[PDB]
Design a protein around this ligand. Structure first.
Ligand SMILES: CCCCCCCCCCCCCC
Ligand SMILES: CCCCCCCCCCCCCC
Ligand SMILES: CCCCCCCCCCCCCC
Ligand SMILES: CCCCCCCCCCCCCC
Ligand SMILES: CCCCCCCCCCCCCC
Ligand SMILES: CCCCCCCCCCCCCC
Ligand SMILES: CCCCCCCCCCCCCC
Ligand SMILES: CCCCCCCCCCCCCC
Lengths: 55, 55
């Protein structure tokens, strides 16, 4: 259960977060720019919870 | 002067007007949709002034 939950997160998300996202869904016209909330503080806590599950 | 002014308008504009324009300049992000004012009434008067200059 520890290995299987680490492989789903590597496939879906990765292990960081960027500040600007580019979205191509509907009803939005062509492509839009969207901005995230605290993308640097969240990246620090993603790496803290990776080392805990590897130990 | 009548022929030279008809060839510049055929090259720049054409002889009609559409309702939705797609713009790719700066500072706009990617591509946006822009909407014109009375695009059908103006197309009727573009063709009236074409027949006058051809007669
Ligand atoms: C151990 C509990 C995890 C259950 C896994 C079931 C599959 C999860 C979906 C797989 C991702 C699909 C993305 C297209
Ligand atoms: C955008 C720059 C992010 C910098 C990431 C720094 C992460 C430090 C986390 C320390 C984890 C160590 C656990 C013992
Ligand atoms: C320069 C940006 C680096 C971002 C990742 C930093 C990770 C360093 C911390 C590793 C902790 C390992 C503890 C065993
Ligand atoms: C952007 C991703 C950076 C990942 C760097 C951290 C890797 C963790 C290595 C140390 C793990 C300690 C296991 C005991
Ligand atoms: C008879 C007066 C017309 C003057 C014509 C001078 C050239 C006009 C510009 C040509 C179009 C350039 C588009 C790139
Ligand atoms: C979008 C549909 C536009 C229909 C254009 C109709 C143009 C009629 C103009 C008549 C010109 C005749 C001059 C004698
Ligand atoms: C179906 C849309 C047709 C649009 C153009 C119509 C132009 C017809 C009028 C031509 C006038 C010619 C008078 C000599
Ligand atoms: C969308 C453009 C339609 C143009 C149709 C009208 C062409 C004009 C033909 C009649 C001209 C009369 C000259 C004497």
């Amino acid at each position: 259960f520890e290995v299987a939950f680490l492989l789903i997160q590597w496939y879906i998300y990765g292990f960081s977060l960027s500040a600007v996202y580019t979205c191509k869904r509907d009803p939005c016209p062509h492509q839009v720019d969207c901005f995230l909330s605290r993308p640097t503080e969240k990246t620090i806590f993603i790496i803290f919870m990776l080392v805990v599950s590897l130990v």
